[PDB]
Amino acid sequence: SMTEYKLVVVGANGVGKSALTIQLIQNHFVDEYDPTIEDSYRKQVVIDGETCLLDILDTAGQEEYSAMRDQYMRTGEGFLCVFAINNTKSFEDIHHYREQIKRVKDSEDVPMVLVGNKCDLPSRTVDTKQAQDLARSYGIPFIETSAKTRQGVDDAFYTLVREIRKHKEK
Amino acid sequence: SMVNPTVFFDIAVDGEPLGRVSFELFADKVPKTAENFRALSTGEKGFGYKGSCFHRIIPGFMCQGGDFTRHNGTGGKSIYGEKFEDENFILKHTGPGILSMANAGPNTNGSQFFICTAKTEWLDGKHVVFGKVKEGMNIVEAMERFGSRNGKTSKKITIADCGQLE
Numbered sequence A: 001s002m003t004e005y006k007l008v009v010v011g012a013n014g015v016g017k018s019a020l021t022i023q024l025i026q027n028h029f030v031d032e033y034d035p036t037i038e039d040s041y042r043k044q045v046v047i048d049g050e051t052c053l054l055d056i057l058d059t060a061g062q063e064e065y066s067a068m069r070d071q072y073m074r075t076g077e078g079f080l081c082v083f084a085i086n087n088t089k090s091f092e093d094i095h096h097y098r099e100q101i102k103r104v105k106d107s108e109d110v111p112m113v114l115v116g117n118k119c120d121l122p123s124r125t126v127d128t129k130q131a132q133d134l135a136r137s138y139g140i141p142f143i144e145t146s147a148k149t150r151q152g153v154d155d156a157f158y159t160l161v162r163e164i165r166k167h168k169e170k
Numbered sequence B: 001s002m003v004n005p006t007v008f009f010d011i012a013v014d015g016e017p018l019g020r021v022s023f024e025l026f027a028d029k030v031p032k033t034a035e036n037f038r039a040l041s042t043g044e045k046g047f048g049y050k051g052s053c054f055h056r057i058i059p060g061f062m063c064q065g066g067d068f069t070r071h072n073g074t075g076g077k078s079i080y081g082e083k084f085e086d087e088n089f090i091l092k093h094t095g096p097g098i099l100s101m102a103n104a105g106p107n108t109n110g111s112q113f114f115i116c117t118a119k120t121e122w123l124d125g126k127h128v129v130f131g132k133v134k135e136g137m138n139i140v141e142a143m144e145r146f147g148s149r150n151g152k153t154s155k156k157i158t159i160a161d162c163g164q165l166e
Ligand SMILES: Nc1nc2c(ncn2[C@@H]2O[C@H](COP(=O)(O)OP(=O)(O)NP(=O)(O)O)[C@@H](O)[C@H]2O)c(=O)[nH]1
Pocket: A011, A012, A013, A014, A015, A016, A017, A018, A019, A020, A030, A031, A032, A033, A034, A035, A036, A037, A059, A060, A061, A062, A117, A118, A119, A120, A121, A145, A146, A147, A148, A149
């Protein structure tokens, strides 16, 4: 078989949205921060034995531009909601992303995965249990990642595809 | 002007001269912000814009530059320190040629700036407007053509020389 999924990566500035995406697409990590305006990538993968094309939209953490961001959200099938484990504000921002996705998609059941990135760093401020509890309250998976070491990168994106497939079964 | 300084940038494309853009700096209404840009344009504090890049050019919107410390779009430094407060919002982003400060939220002005190529009214009250292109809007329009939807440029656009006129 083949299928195709539109994935959208969202979250506050600097949390690692691009680093995670670039690890998935290009298999490398760099310390330099290159702020995003918008980038799009395509990759063919096999998940649970089923081949698919991933169309990944890497969005900016910028907070304005509601009309453009609503357009991202209407077209996206699933959302990686990323925060950094050493940035409490980025974790506190997550609920805003979830609220906006639910409003734009007019549903309380939207495929999404909570991603806690930068787990390689020694400066944690958000503990695993707070993030697990938040994900449980949303009914969505939580995946800890490091774009630097590649820990959890495939898992985050593949889990989101699994969430989309489960949603389509309903 | 009898009050507002004029500064210039000689713009280069992969090192080749494209042309000169001059700016009126509205020291009359935005003195601290105008003075920062003036001094960074002359280099008189020992650092400034000469050699730096227009790292983000988005056709229909703006040409952004001014990172002479990290050279990658993340840096910035004013003559007052790493950052300074939003001085005022007297002037608005009314159309092409407006010169305004880039920032990372309230009170984070450094050295990065942008030149509007269209009205950008959603930036009013968030970015401090402090000058306007005097001569060389045609050069800004030529620069805009090296940009792309995500701002990456197809050739390296730099401030090959800069300074103050008269
Ligand atoms: N140690 C470590 N650094 C990381 C990790 N992920 C990203 N970074 C670093 O954090 C910075 C910002 O990463 P980036 O992916 O650009 O963040 P973003 O969420 O895309 N930012 P924007 O919203 O502005 O596009 C970069 O310096 C990058 O190297 C990670 O897992 N570990």
